[PDB]
Amino acid sequence: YLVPTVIEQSERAFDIYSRLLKERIVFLVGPVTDESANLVVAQLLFLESENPDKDIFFYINSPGGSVTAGMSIYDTMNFIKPDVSTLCLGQAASMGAFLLSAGEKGKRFALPNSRIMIHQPLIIHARELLKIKEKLNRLMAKHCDRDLADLERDTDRDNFMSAEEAKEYGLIDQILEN
Amino acid sequence: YLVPTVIEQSERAFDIYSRLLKERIVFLVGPVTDESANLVVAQLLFLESENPDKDIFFYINSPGGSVTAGMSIYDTMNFIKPDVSTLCLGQAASMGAFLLSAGEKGKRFALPNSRIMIHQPLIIHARELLKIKEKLNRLMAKHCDRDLADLERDTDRDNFMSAEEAKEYGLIDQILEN
Amino acid sequence: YLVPTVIEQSERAFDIYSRLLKERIVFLVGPVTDESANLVVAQLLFLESENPDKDIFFYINSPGGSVTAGMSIYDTMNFIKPDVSTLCLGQAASMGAFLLSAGEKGKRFALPNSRIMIHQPLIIHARELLKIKEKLNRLMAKHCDRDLADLERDTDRDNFMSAEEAKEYGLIDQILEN
Amino acid sequence: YLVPTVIEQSERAFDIYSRLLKERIVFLVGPVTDESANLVVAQLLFLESENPDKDIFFYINSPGGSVTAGMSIYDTMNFIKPDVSTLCLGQAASMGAFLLSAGEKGKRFALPNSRIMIHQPLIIHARELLKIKEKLNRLMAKHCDRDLADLERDTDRDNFMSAEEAKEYGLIDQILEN
Amino acid sequence: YLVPTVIEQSERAFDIYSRLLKERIVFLVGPVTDESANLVVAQLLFLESENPDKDIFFYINSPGGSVTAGMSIYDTMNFIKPDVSTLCLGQAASMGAFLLSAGEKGKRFALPNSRIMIHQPLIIHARELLKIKEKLNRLMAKHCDRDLADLERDTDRDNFMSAEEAKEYGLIDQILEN
Amino acid sequence: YLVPTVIEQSERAFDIYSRLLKERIVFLVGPVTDESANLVVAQLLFLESENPDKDIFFYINSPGGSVTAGMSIYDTMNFIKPDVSTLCLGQAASMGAFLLSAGEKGKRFALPNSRIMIHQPLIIHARELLKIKEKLNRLMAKHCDRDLADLERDTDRDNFMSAEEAKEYGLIDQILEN
Amino acid sequence: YLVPTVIEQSERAFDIYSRLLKERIVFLVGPVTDESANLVVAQLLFLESENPDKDIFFYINSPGGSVTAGMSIYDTMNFIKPDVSTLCLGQAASMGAFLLSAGEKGKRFALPNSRIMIHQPLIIHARELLKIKEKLNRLMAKHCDRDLADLERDTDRDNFMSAEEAKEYGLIDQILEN
Amino acid sequence: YLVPTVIEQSERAFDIYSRLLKERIVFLVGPVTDESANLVVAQLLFLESENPDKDIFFYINSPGGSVTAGMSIYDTMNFIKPDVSTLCLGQAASMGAFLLSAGEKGKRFALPNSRIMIHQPLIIHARELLKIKEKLNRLMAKHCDRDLADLERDTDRDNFMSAEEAKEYGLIDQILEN
Amino acid sequence: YLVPTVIEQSERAFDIYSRLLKERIVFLVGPVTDESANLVVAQLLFLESENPDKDIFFYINSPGGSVTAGMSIYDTMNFIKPDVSTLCLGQAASMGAFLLSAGEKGKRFALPNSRIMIHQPLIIHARELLKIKEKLNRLMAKHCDRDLADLERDTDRDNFMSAEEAKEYGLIDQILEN
Amino acid sequence: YLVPTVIEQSERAFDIYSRLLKERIVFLVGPVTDESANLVVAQLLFLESENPDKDIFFYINSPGGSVTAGMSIYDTMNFIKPDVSTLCLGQAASMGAFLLSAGEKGKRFALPNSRIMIHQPLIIHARELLKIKEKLNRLMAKHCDRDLADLERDTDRDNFMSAEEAKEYGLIDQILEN
Amino acid sequence: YLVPTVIEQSERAFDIYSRLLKERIVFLVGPVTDESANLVVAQLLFLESENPDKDIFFYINSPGGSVTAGMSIYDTMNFIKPDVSTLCLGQAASMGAFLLSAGEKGKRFALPNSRIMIHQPLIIHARELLKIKEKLNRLMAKHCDRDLADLERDTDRDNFMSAEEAKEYGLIDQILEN
Known about the structure:
Helix content of chain A: 40-55%
Structural class of chain A: alpha/beta
CATH class of chain A: Alpha Beta
Distance between the termini of chain A: 29 Å
Entry title: ClpP from Neisseria meningitidis - Compressed conformation
PDB class: hydrolase
Order of helices and strands of chain A: EEHEHEHEHEEHHHE
Shape of chain A: globular
Largest interface: A-B, 35 and 36 residues
Strand content of chain A: 15-25%
CATH topology of chain A: 2-enoyl-CoA Hydratase, Chain A, domain 1
Number of strands of chain A: 8
Number of domains of chain A: 1
Keywords: protease, ClpP, hydrolase
CATH architecture of chain A: Alpha-Beta Complex
Chains A and 10 copies: ATP-dependent Clp protease proteolytic subunit
Radius of gyration of chain A: 16 Å
Oligomer: part of a larger assembly
Organism of A, B, C, D, E, F: Neisseria meningitidis
């Protein structure tokens, strides 16, 4: 795709994504891969360095992806000093929902027509996948202020939640209309 | 394709799309994908930032695409402060028609020889697709000042509407000859 | 993937990876190949030249790769004067775990949700692979302050270790939460 | 792969390989092909031109490749005035080992965990390959201060030598730990 | 392949091939194709224009290629005023050997370990290929100061000549060791 | 695969499947396709013709398949006079479970380690698939002596039932150990 | 697929399809192609020859196919003396529905869970397809005792009819449960 | 492959596999698939019918395969009246080892150089695979007169057992040299 | 390939391979696979059954193959009562040489221009392949009346032996000219 | 290809190749492969068995093939008692020429417009191919009553001989016009 | 393609080609390949054997093919005692025209709308193809009672001759209308 160039007044020419990175917006679009995860991490590290006291807005539009790739993003967000806010656009599923729910508590947002899926399909052998299964359900339960039993019950099913359902579940704090 | 470069007098060299983005024109061409949807969103966010009080012209030439990708565009247009006007060029179908009808009421336009299709083929399981089916028919009914029953009847069929038929249906407000 | 551009204040425009290389961060992402290994080496040599007394931070997110490619990285890290610190993000497996464990003793780190695998699948004939097998187990035993017998026992199995298990094993020195 | 950009203080921006070429380091990575061989030659000719009295460091990480391509490198190294030092990183095999052994006598180096293979698989008809077979064994014998009989015996087998074995064989002069 | 950038002192940044073109070196690497032949021609025309009295060094490393493509190079070399010297690196075969032998008489060189093949496989119908066969054998005989009968005999066989054999044959004038 | 030949004493040579068809056993193995469904139908029609008063044993080992293909089998079983008994071997899922449950009431069997899935993924437009969805849930409810509400609830989930669970659900009448 | 062999008592061994052809059953399964249409025709001609006064049962399970191929079947059925009865199993769509409706009036049957689609997608230029469109709608109107206007209205939509709806439409005469 | 034909004296010509089926030998060769499993089942059912009091010899040479396919074989062997003896030739792994261990107790054999692997890789979601995991470990523990804990420990690792180790484990009863 | 049919006088028509199986000749041609190994086993079992006191001639023309597949042949030959003679035609390598050497001692033959290779490339993890490596070297040493040390030395190299060299090595007993 | 069936009067139906095998004609057509070589061997063994005192006519039309495959044919022809005559049809090259020349001395024939090539391209390593090269040149020299030096000279070139040239060379004894 | 079966009254069932072979008609259809040429030869040899005094009718419908394959047919036709008549159906080109013209003089026929092309495209090196070129032109000149100069002129062009032109040229003797 052709990525548009915009001009910042200060003049500096940036592609549209770099222009938004300047505003501390990091995008995760499409499946989480080692490469896309590392770009998210590189951007998060960069933004902390430029100003440790300013929020980072992590926009998620993603069907899922690699667990380890997603976990590198997760730990980076928890590790770096500035709060990382999250926003769900279109969808957040599997690791995408995980990363959404993992944003700074009180700053996790969704747009009204988004769909959030907490199902973790986990696809290594047979007991290595379970260590992951349990680890993710525990972290989700923590993020959601829910019992481990509730996440064990719900991350089992590929059902989507509306932004309101996700808010009540505890994955997001607010729904943004304007 | 080779994308031409034009010179803005102020001089600044831009590709033709970036030059038109400078005039607040955002293009959606071809199928709506996560990547193309995110480029539309990135452009819409950018334009709001540069001047929240100036209209954005969203030009649509698209056969359809992913629902969630289209919904990220939809919510962005509804979310950002400046009115987002829409124009149908060639065609708008499925999600393209949705996004066309979703433009700011009173500023939804079509060119005379365009063809607009409101059919929503929806192609997840079997009851997750219906949540979408109903959600889109309700939003279309809202956009069109039509009963839900009318959209349930018409989004069922892959028939195309002329710009005049779309105007009477309520998808567009005006047809532009000059 | 589109790699974002950021601006260094001094102005200089860099892609995000080059911007982090400026901060002495070298990334190894994905499988270790001759090309990716040589890029790591080129970066390590460069950084030593710019300032031999400053630490290099080598970030690893890798499932494994070629042994000889990994060994060129290993010898470069041991060869160049400045300490090379390591960090595991997401995962380090096979040669990735080797390179992680190979970082400067006292400066080998992991993030809390990473997974470290010391299994060396070794995939030449039949006795050329064993020279490698033994060489890697001896180096691992050295890195870990473990008996050769312990590495012979554990590099045999494709089990993953948590950051805490890796710390107790002796692959890493510290786990970083913040 | 994305090749990082670094800044030379003098400022000049270079990719990492060009930055190291400035320091007279030429890399041969991966199989020797007509294109990669010609890049090595072009770099060697360039470096001689800039300063005929300064050593060139030729870093080799290569499984082998075309004989004629390798011979163009070989003759260029012997032809150009400045000594061309060599270093084995990871591995040097077949033509790679040939080029390693072919470096300036007294300046042929290897890293400790590298593996050097002098086997020449030679893969033209049946007697054209032998002219090559004999020519390479004679040149190897010359480089190594070994009898033709010894190279005829050893270039026959696909066994790898450790850096110490290669040093005793006569392929390299020194092993570099620091 | 990544082509290195070097800096000319005058500063001007050039890729390594352009930097050598500045020194009047033209490279023909790999098979002769319409595109690669035209690049050689474009470079030869350019160099004549910049300075008609300075020699051009045409470096050949090529297994062969299209006859008509090779003939465009041949006529350009004969046509342009400055002497075009030739050098064989690695190999020159079929059209490559033709172009090597076609260099300015007294300035045709080879490196010591190169291999030169004058066999012309000629692969149109059946009598169109013979017009070419005869034309090339006559031109070779001219270049070599040999009888047509000798070229008819030797261009028949796919045997390689050493630089010394090529010198005695009459394809090259000198062999360059230093 | 090679299909074995066996001899019937009466002698007549049959492939193993034809030999079992002679004993009134019809196999459905693998996905239900138009071709495999028609073979089942052809066999069922044949067997009724040979003896309308003898039971037909329909052995099912199938992950699912086309609905219309499965329905041709279903109607044939209901249509032909002799009772069609069913047996689940390995698995019966989607249409396979449907056909299993559809066997003559009182003669629906499963083997102890089989797994039965009543989930109907239904993969036409959007309201044509629902006519099918409802039709299949109603027929399942009939077969199982369950409310439509129970099948609407359970055919929604891709969970497998053990033979005992299927027996309690009402899909099978008996479990056969010997 | 393996086609079973059955034995006719008279003994004669037949594959299951040939055994049913002996009972005057002709199957059309899957898309109508020139080859499958010609097999249907060959069977119909054969059966008329063996006994011109006995009905032929043409079983249809088909999504559609070539118009000309379907028309050869249609004319053969109308041409040959014995009545050709039809039965819909699973489905009959496009040309399949045409051929179903085309059976002898009073002997057109469907099984209860079949789905019949009269939509004729017609996929030549632009006016050659219309000659077909009109011809098929006229023949359907004839078969159904419906106005041309009704078929013009309904063959326009890809909706499926239940056996009862098809009976009321006039495509079939009876629905067979037993 | 061409399958040889042999003549039975009684004369009857059989392919070699059918000739051995006559001697009650059933072969499972290669991966267990729905088709190969059903052929094994068809053969087992046939053999029981011909003589319920004669042993069946099931020869296994298989790396593994589908669980449900393997379970249909397992239940058939347990279900049919005559003892089913088993023999491991070459190897039995995963489901192959399961089926080997599942033979009639006291009649489970292996050849001396065979290799038996009880590892069950299980490759559905995440808790459907565990129902299988537990079910197979329980059945293995039963077959082997071992604790569930021992199978949970050993079916975890992809290690091979010699025939003697398998005998001591309890997978086989005897090793056959002659 | 078309396999010729020949007539046995007794008349019985056989393909040429079946005709030779009647003479107790079993062929192993090409790579040893599970399927080809099982055909060899099936033939060996058959021949023992027809006459346990008559020799079987196993003709080998094979580059190698699967170890486990080869071992099933090996154990069958050792297991069945009649001596199994072997003959090398063209070549026997890897497992082919193993099976050749494994024939009945005193009846292992080769044709004069055959080439026998005892190299065992063994291509599982890293210590599972060694169990095989050692097992095969021990069996070879047994077959050859050689020390384990000699086979460890020679099965290491991909050199071919002439029939005379194989005879002296101890792989074969006799060379057959007539 | 469809292979015709002919009737032998004695009646017995044979395919045309089997009918000619009955007349002791063995065909080698196309490249020599392990499979085609083994069919030739199987036929030669068969024919010797039926009548050891009758000549076998081996018809060759072949561009070449595997050496070991060809050698199995060669040794079989030399091994079996009846003279094996040879005939070249169309061509005999490489191994085909070898096998032609290898026929019984005094009974080696060619048709007048055939082309015979003794070039042995030999396409293993580098000294394993030479053992073959020398072995084949020695056998050819034997067959032709020529010096080893003459075959070393001529098997070097891919030139074709007419039947008369082959006769004078010593590859064939006679040329057959009628 | 399905090849029809016909019944010979004597009854004997033959495929249609075998039935015509019985009438001494040999067909060459499509390109001449080693396999199709050998089938023609096998048929010609067979027919001579059955009755050396009866004509063979060789029907040609072929665009061309391999020269050596065609020459094996040519020599067989000239070699075998009975006259081989030829007939051109549809076309005869290149080797097909050669074989047509090569039929027994006075018995070479063509059908009226056939097209005969004597162009010999000859598609080896460059002088091996000419030996063929000359040989074929000489044989054509012989067949046609034309000068070598005339065939050298006309076999040069890819023009087609009508049956009348071919008759006047001398390729055929008669044109058959009835």
